[PDB]
Amino acid sequence: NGIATLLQAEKEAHEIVSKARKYRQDKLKQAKTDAAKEIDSYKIQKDKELKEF
Amino acid sequence: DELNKMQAFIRKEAEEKAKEIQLKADQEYEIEKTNIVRNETNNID
Numbered sequence: 001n002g003i004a005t006l007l008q009a010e011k012e013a014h015e016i017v018s019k020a021r022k023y024r025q026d027k028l029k030q031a032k033t034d035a036a037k038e039i040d041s042y043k044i045q046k047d048k049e050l051k052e053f
Numbered sequence: 054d055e056l057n058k059m060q061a062f063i064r065k066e067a068e069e070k071a072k073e074i075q076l077k078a079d080q081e082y083e084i085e086k087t088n089i090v091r092n093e094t095n096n097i098d
Contacts, residue, residue, distance in 0.1 A: 001054070001057035001060075002057065003054075003057035003058045003060065003061035004057055004060055004061060004064070006061055006065075007060065007061040007062075007063075007064035007065050007068070008064070010061075010064065010065040010068045011064060011065075011067070011068040011071070013068065014068035014069065014071045014072040014075075015071075017072040017075060017076075018071060018072060018075035020075075021072070021075035021076050021078060021079040022075075022079070024076070024079040025078070025079040025082040025083065028079065028082060028083035028086065029082075029086060031083065031086075031087075032083070032086035032087065032089070032090060035086065035087050035090035035091075036089075036090045036093060038090065038094075039090045039091065039093045039094035039097055040097055042094055042097070042098065043094070043097035043098055046098055
């Protein structure tokens, strides 16, 4: 039916939103790379202290 | 029809729940990604 098709479109939009949730996780993956860089930055600071010694 | 409209709202409501569940998964992935970076920090240290 037309109403059911509109509901399917809303489900498709939710499916797109579900795909966007992975994109949101992909958007959050950019912060993960920054978090990984921060982890390396902490090691770099520790390495710099070791290098200074 | 009235039955089709009633079924449309129920399916639309389930779509919102699916989107909310998907959004919650994205938040969990960010938390898990931070934990992975934190775990890598100990190995990098």
